[PDB]
Amino acid sequence: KVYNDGYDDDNYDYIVKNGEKWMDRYEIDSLIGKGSFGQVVKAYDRVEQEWVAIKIIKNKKAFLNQAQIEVRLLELMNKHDTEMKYYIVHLKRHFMFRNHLCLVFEMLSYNLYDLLRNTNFRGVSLNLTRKFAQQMCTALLFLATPELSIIHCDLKPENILLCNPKRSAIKIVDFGSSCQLGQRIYQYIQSRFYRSPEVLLGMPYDLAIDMWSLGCILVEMHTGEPLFSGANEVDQMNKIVEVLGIPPAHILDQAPKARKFFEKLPDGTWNLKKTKEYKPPGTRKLHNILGVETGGPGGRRAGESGHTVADYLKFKDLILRMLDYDPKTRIQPYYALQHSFFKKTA
Numbered sequence: 001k002v003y004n005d006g007y008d009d010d011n012y013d014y015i016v017k018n019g020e021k022w023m024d025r026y027e028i029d030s031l032i033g034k035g036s037f038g039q040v041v042k043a044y045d046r047v048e049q050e051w052v053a054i055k056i057i058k059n060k061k062a063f064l065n066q067a068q069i070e071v072r073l074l075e076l077m078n079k080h081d082t083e084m085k086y087y088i089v090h091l092k093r094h095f096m097f098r099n100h101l102c103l104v105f106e107m108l109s110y111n112l113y114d115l116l117r118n119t120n121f122r123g124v125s126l127n128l129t130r131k132f133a134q135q136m137c138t139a140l141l142f143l144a145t146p147e148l149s150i151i152h153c154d155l156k157p158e159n160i161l162l163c164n165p166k167r168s169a170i171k172i173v174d175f176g177s178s179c180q181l182g183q184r185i186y187q188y189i190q191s192r193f194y195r196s197p198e199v200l201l202g203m204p205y206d207l208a209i210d211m212w213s214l215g216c217i218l219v220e221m222h223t224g225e226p227l228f229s230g231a232n233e234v235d236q237m238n239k240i241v242e243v244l245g246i247p248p249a250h251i252l253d254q255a256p257k258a259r260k261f262f263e264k265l266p267d268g269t270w271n272l273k274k275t276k277e278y279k280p281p282g283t284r285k286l287h288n289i290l291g292v293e294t295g296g297p298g299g300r301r302a303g304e305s306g307h308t309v310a311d312y313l314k315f316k317d318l319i320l321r322m323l324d325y326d327p328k329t330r331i332q333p334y335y336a337l338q339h340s341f342f343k344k345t346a
């Protein structure tokens with residue numbers, strides 16, 4: 001049985017061959033990543049005399065079209081950030097090769113989940129968490145510029161990459177599930193652990209869903225573990241409620257899916273539907289998850305510099321603003337960047 005004239009496997013992936021030359025230009029060196037979309041290779045661009053990463057999309061219409069959306073959004077972001085100051089991966093060019101769409105990027109290092117694994121899932125320092133937060137809020141500010149108005153829709157540690165393994169510089173990747181405000185099509189979006197309450201509830205959404213994901217990512221970067229690790233949507237909402245309490249009635253009153261998770265009482269207040277058993281609503285305090293007064297996560301930052309009670313209070317406050325249940329009042333990128341968590345003291 002033959003796929004794409006022998007170039008592909010049965011899963012429509014290009015069969016990567018070390019050393020192959022493409023288009024009298026690229027020498028494929030090695031495979032450096034693989035996922036649902038296809039594969040990522042390190043290649044030498046002989047024309048520009050530099051290493052590049054080529055994302056080789058599966059030869060399958062659904063994957064091709066997902067990557068064509070990504071190409072258009074990255075090209076739009078390109079028109080608007082030529083100095084590469086806003087922390088989005090740079091798409092150099094694209095081409096079709098042997099029935100695979102191929103996206104050529106600058107070569108980056110490993111992702112923030114790999115970085116968490118490298119900490120043995122104990123987390124990075126509050127200082128490094130702050131550097132990641134500042135860069136991500138800058139990226140979100142750029143995506144919110146009106147000519148872009150891009151909702152990434154799948155922010156998670158795996159979609160944030162280090163530029164260099166020694167260093168704090170990061171880029172956001174993977175715009176295949178993205179969309180623009182006023183061209184919102186998807187009802188089902190975001191990876192579960194990072195999914196906002198408005199999406200869980202079946203409500204209208206906007207760029208604020210990415211800020212929710214960022215709040216979740218930053219707590220996980222410092223603790224080593226996902227903040228809200230739901231096994232399914234009901235479990236996800238229940239985990240959110242353990243930390244943040246029952247969502248506001250004004251929100252639940254307008255939520256198409258309120259009754260998937262909650263019940264409306266005679267007095268018009270809302271409670272959780274019973275299990276078929278969680279910490280009571282709001283009793284799993286972020287204050288304690290972060291260890292604000294008790295030496296940080298697991299008490300492991302006791303006796304370390306750069307981890308004071310005062311700095312933990314600033315981090316907690318910023319995260320709580322990113323995790324506001326109301327997407328209208330949730331902190332926005334411009335104001336997050338001005339928050340006291342980013343103000344130096346001492």
Ligand SMILES: COc1ccc2c(c1)CC(C)(C)c1c(N)ncnc1-2
Pocket residue numbers: 032033034035040053054055089105106107108109173174
């Ligand atoms: C499994 O998913 C992966 C694996 C590796 C990478 C990406 C996705 C994203 C891109 C293609 C942007 C990239 C890069 N530019 N440099 C290095 N690695 C990667």
